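Predict structure. Chain length: 308.
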Amino acid sequence: MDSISLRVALNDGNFIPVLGFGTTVPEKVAKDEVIKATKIAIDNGFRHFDSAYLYEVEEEVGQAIRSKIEDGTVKREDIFYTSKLWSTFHRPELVRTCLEKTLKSTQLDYVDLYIIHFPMALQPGDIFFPRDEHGKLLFETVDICDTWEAMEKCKDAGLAKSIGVSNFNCRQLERILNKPGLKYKPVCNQVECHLYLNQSKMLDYCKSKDIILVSYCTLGSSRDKTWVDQKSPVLLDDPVLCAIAKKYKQTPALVALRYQLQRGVVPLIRSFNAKRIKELTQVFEFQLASEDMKALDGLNRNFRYNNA
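Prediction complete.
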């Protein structure tokens, strides 16, 4: 349902910005002074940011937000922040610790969204992926509905403005939303989507239950990418995609954006280079014809470039 303007309805009668930014592993050159890169993000309009416990940037991303509410650029109501509850911290009697641990470290007043980062729950502790000495990980059975009971509580507790899920599919999704006595329903489902795994099936489902598919790896990432094995498919160098983004001029990042935006999906861009965060404010100076949309709503393999 069409997007492309600055803000959008989200369940709770709360409004998300439509195009977002992400934070994680970096560029060798210049390295992990991420504060600077989030500064060439809010100095551009970029108001919705996405982080996690796991790829902690928080302490130093929190701070650049907490510097523009000092320049006199931002005023809080204007800043939307996603963070995530971690797999270890999934055990119900403790959820809120991850949240506080998330909020002290950001120096932000509270968070705007908190989401279920995984059904995959591992035991409580100090190492974020405790493999069982070896093999795979020590995992323990806590419950998905239960962590959601333990999520709503916190909104109702004023600590995080809205709640949502991530990496859930239609089976884990339906469950969240089917449990006894649910109160605050899901907003987003930050699954990975883009032209080569653009879930037409999650879209004609998320939307049925007002769940807003926010997406990572929208522009394919490609640089370095710590999961590359297949000696083949660099999508933002693809045939069709490097055609249409000449038929409407400038190289295929902006079409990678444009399409998803145009489907009515809330994308996440990562960057650090000023340059590629700036070609992306252009994502609204373009347009997309339906023939083309279908010549784009065609590229899909179904290869998940990120894997569990």
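Summary: Residues 58-71 form the longest helix (14 residues).
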